[PDB]
Design an enzyme around this catalytic site. Structure first.
Site, PDB file in Angstrom:
ATOM      1  N   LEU A 139       0.812  -1.217   0.000  1.00  0.00           N
ATOM      2  CA  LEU A 139       0.000   0.000   0.000  1.00  0.00           C
ATOM      3  C   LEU A 139       0.848   1.272   0.000  1.00  0.00           C
ATOM      4  O   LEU A 139       0.453   2.286  -0.575  1.00  0.00           O
ATOM      5  CB  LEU A 139      -0.965   0.009   1.193  1.00  0.00           C
ATOM      6  CG  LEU A 139      -1.982  -1.130   1.342  1.00  0.00           C
ATOM      7  CD1 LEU A 139      -2.655  -1.068   2.707  1.00  0.00           C
ATOM      8  CD2 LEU A 139      -3.026  -1.113   0.230  1.00  0.00           C
ATOM      9  N   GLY A 140       2.007   1.211   0.653  1.00  0.00           N
ATOM     10  CA  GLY A 140       2.915   2.353   0.745  1.00  0.00           C
ATOM     11  C   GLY A 140       4.211   2.017   1.460  1.00  0.00           C
ATOM     12  O   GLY A 140       4.262   1.083   2.263  1.00  0.00           O
ATOM     13  N   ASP A 186      -1.782  17.218  13.250  1.00  0.00           N
ATOM     14  CA  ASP A 186      -1.536  17.155  11.799  1.00  0.00           C
ATOM     15  C   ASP A 186      -2.802  16.784  11.026  1.00  0.00           C
ATOM     16  O   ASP A 186      -2.772  15.952  10.114  1.00  0.00           O
ATOM     17  CB  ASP A 186      -0.371  16.208  11.465  1.00  0.00           C
ATOM     18  CG  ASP A 186       0.226  16.463  10.072  1.00  0.00           C
ATOM     19  OD1 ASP A 186      -0.160  17.451   9.404  1.00  0.00           O
ATOM     20  OD2 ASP A 186       1.086  15.664   9.641  1.00  0.00           O
ATOM     21  N   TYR A 237      -8.718  -2.124   7.631  1.00  0.00           N
ATOM     22  CA  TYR A 237      -8.361  -1.796   6.261  1.00  0.00           C
ATOM     23  C   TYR A 237      -9.351  -0.799   5.678  1.00  0.00           C
ATOM     24  O   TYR A 237     -10.564  -0.965   5.802  1.00  0.00           O
ATOM     25  CB  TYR A 237      -8.278  -3.062   5.398  1.00  0.00           C
ATOM     26  CG  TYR A 237      -7.909  -2.796   3.958  1.00  0.00           C
ATOM     27  CD1 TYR A 237      -6.682  -2.216   3.626  1.00  0.00           C
ATOM     28  CD2 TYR A 237      -8.787  -3.118   2.926  1.00  0.00           C
ATOM     29  CE1 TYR A 237      -6.346  -1.964   2.300  1.00  0.00           C
ATOM     30  CE2 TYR A 237      -8.459  -2.873   1.605  1.00  0.00           C
ATOM     31  CZ  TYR A 237      -7.240  -2.295   1.299  1.00  0.00           C
ATOM     32  OH  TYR A 237      -6.916  -2.058  -0.017  1.00  0.00           O
ATOM     33  N   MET A 238      -8.814   0.244   5.057  1.00  0.00           N
ATOM     34  CA  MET A 238      -9.626   1.285   4.439  1.00  0.00           C
ATOM     35  C   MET A 238      -9.475   1.184   2.927  1.00  0.00           C
ATOM     36  O   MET A 238      -8.505   1.682   2.356  1.00  0.00           O
ATOM     37  CB  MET A 238      -9.195   2.658   4.961  1.00  0.00           C
ATOM     38  CG  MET A 238      -9.168   2.738   6.487  1.00  0.00           C
ATOM     39  SD  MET A 238     -10.820   2.719   7.214  1.00  0.00           S
ATOM     40  CE  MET A 238     -11.388   4.345   6.741  1.00  0.00           C
TER      41      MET A 238
HETATM   42  C1  04K Z   1      -3.148   1.851  -6.811  1.00  0.00           C
HETATM   43  C2  04K Z   1      -1.972   2.137  -5.872  1.00  0.00           C
HETATM   44  N1  04K Z   1      -2.300   1.728  -4.494  1.00  0.00           N
HETATM   45  C3  04K Z   1      -1.479   0.538  -4.207  1.00  0.00           C
HETATM   46  C4  04K Z   1      -2.379  -0.689  -4.024  1.00  0.00           C
HETATM   47  C5  04K Z   1      -1.831   2.823  -3.627  1.00  0.00           C
HETATM   48  C6  04K Z   1      -2.339   2.657  -2.189  1.00  0.00           C
HETATM   49  O1  04K Z   1      -3.742   2.921  -2.120  1.00  0.00           O
HETATM   50  C7  04K Z   1      -4.208   2.652  -0.861  1.00  0.00           C
HETATM   51  C8  04K Z   1      -5.249   1.743  -0.713  1.00  0.00           C
HETATM   52  C9  04K Z   1      -5.749   1.454   0.547  1.00  0.00           C
HETATM   53  C10 04K Z   1      -5.218   2.070   1.682  1.00  0.00           C
HETATM   54  N2  04K Z   1      -5.789   1.747   2.929  1.00  0.00           N
HETATM   55  C11 04K Z   1      -5.186   1.776   4.176  1.00  0.00           C
HETATM   56  N3  04K Z   1      -5.860   1.206   5.173  1.00  0.00           N
HETATM   57  C12 04K Z   1      -5.382   1.183   6.407  1.00  0.00           C
HETATM   58  C13 04K Z   1      -4.133   1.768   6.654  1.00  0.00           C
HETATM   59  C14 04K Z   1      -3.527   1.756   7.986  1.00  0.00           C
HETATM   60  C15 04K Z   1      -2.300   2.331   8.165  1.00  0.00           C
HETATM   61  O2  04K Z   1      -1.695   2.300   9.397  1.00  0.00           O
HETATM   62  C16 04K Z   1      -2.042   3.234  10.334  1.00  0.00           C
HETATM   63  C17 04K Z   1      -1.049   3.622  11.231  1.00  0.00           C
HETATM   64  C18 04K Z   1      -1.311   4.548  12.227  1.00  0.00           C
HETATM   65  C19 04K Z   1      -2.583   5.091  12.343  1.00  0.00           C
HETATM   66  F1  04K Z   1      -2.842   5.999  13.315  1.00  0.00           F
HETATM   67  C20 04K Z   1      -3.586   4.699  11.462  1.00  0.00           C
HETATM   68  C21 04K Z   1      -3.322   3.771  10.463  1.00  0.00           C
HETATM   69  C22 04K Z   1      -1.642   2.929   7.051  1.00  0.00           C
HETATM   70  O3  04K Z   1      -0.543   3.434   7.227  1.00  0.00           O
HETATM   71  N4  04K Z   1      -2.202   2.950   5.812  1.00  0.00           N
HETATM   72  C23 04K Z   1      -1.484   3.575   4.690  1.00  0.00           C
HETATM   73  C24 04K Z   1      -3.434   2.373   5.577  1.00  0.00           C
HETATM   74  N5  04K Z   1      -3.998   2.349   4.366  1.00  0.00           N
HETATM   75  C25 04K Z   1      -4.181   2.995   1.533  1.00  0.00           C
HETATM   76  C26 04K Z   1      -3.680   3.285   0.269  1.00  0.00           C
END
Ligand code: 04K
Length: 248
Positions: free
Chosen positions: A18-19, A128, A83-84
């Site tokens: 995801l990142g 933030d 998961y979001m």
């Molecule tokens: C097409 C390209 N695609 C690749 C598949 C790009 C990515 O697209 C997406 C798709 C879905 C998501 N969903 C998503 N869901 C939950 C989290 C939880 C995380 O941790 C936390 C840590 C601390 C906190 F307080 C909350 C959450 C976190 O960090 N990220 C990022 C998350 N990203 C995020 C990005």
């Protein structure tokens, strides 16, 4: 031990990145969708990890990204959250406009406001708040995560480093503006330096075309020069609900 928060890493299945600390999509016990954050060795400290994890262990709300557990009996440590599916709100506003109508913009604002009212009641400062730090689930529900961003900061933060409930209020106003501008960068033609100067001189963000006068009044109230004159999240929430009822 983190008690019932300790997750067996054996129960995780990794599926997509995801990142990148590296965040991945996966499943817990083959039933629940989760995000798995892999904190890379070297970053953070002994005490730094302990603080932030326990912050998430003590805060829980429908509109806050929910921690499910931690994997700490191994390296690298995993953080497991809900998961979001629709990712970052900023990208959603910019790239997923086919999924929401004008009436739903206020709903996104309400979602964030509910999260912030909860944080406010726990005397917890986000520090933030911005679209880039919110996530969107499969149903289009916005949730706050990650609880220098000059463009989201009030004059007292920029001049004196005075953080309070009221600096979160200011940032929320800017977030409403991000939502109604469909993900524009605030003060789009200015640098951070110019933004700071303009804010101190009483310049404020214009009314986005999609925002009604009543909606603009809400975001504008967040930007009072005097911090004490800015509303609380409780007040903002009541205002948002009032406008929702009147505009739908
Ligand atoms: C097409 C390209 N695609 C690749 C598949 C790009 C990515 O697209 C997406 C798709 C879905 C998501 N969903 C998503 N869901 C939950 C989290 C939880 C995380 O941790 C936390 C840590 C601390 C906190 F307080 C909350 C959450 C976190 O960090 N990220 C990022 C998350 N990203 C995020 C990005």
């Amino acid at each position: 031990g983190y008690g019932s928060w300790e997750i067996d890493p054996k129960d995780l299945t990794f599926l997509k990145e995801l990142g990148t600390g590296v965040v991945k999509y996966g499943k817990w016990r083959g039933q629940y969708d989760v995000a798995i954050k892999m904190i890379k060795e070297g970053s953070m400290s002994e005490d730094e990890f302990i603080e932030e994890a326990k912050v998430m262990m003590n805060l829980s709300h429908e509109k806050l990204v929910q921690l499910y557990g931690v994997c700490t009996k191994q390296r690298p440590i995993f953080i497991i959250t809900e998961y979001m599916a629709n990712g970052c709100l900023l990208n959603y506003l910019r790239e997923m406009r086919h999924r929401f109508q004008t009436q739903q913009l206020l709903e996104m604002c309400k979602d964030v406001c509910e999260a912030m009212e909860y944080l406010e009641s726990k005397q917890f400062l986000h520090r933030d708040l911005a679209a880039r730090n919110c996530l969107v689930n499969d149903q289009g529900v916005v949730k706050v995560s990650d609880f220098f961003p000059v463009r989201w900061s009030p004059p007292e933060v920029l001049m004196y480093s005075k953080f309070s409930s009221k600096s979160d209020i200011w940032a929320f106003g800017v977030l409403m503006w991000e939502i109604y501008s469909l993900g524009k960068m605030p003060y789009e033609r200015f640098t951070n330096s110019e933004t700071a100067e303009h804010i101190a001189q009483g310049l404020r963000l214009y009314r986005p075309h999609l925002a009604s006068e009543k909606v603009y009044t809400i975001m504008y109230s967040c930007w009072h020069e005097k911090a004490d004159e800015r509303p609380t999240f409780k007040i903002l929430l009541s205002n948002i609900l009032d406008v929702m009822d009147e505009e739908s």
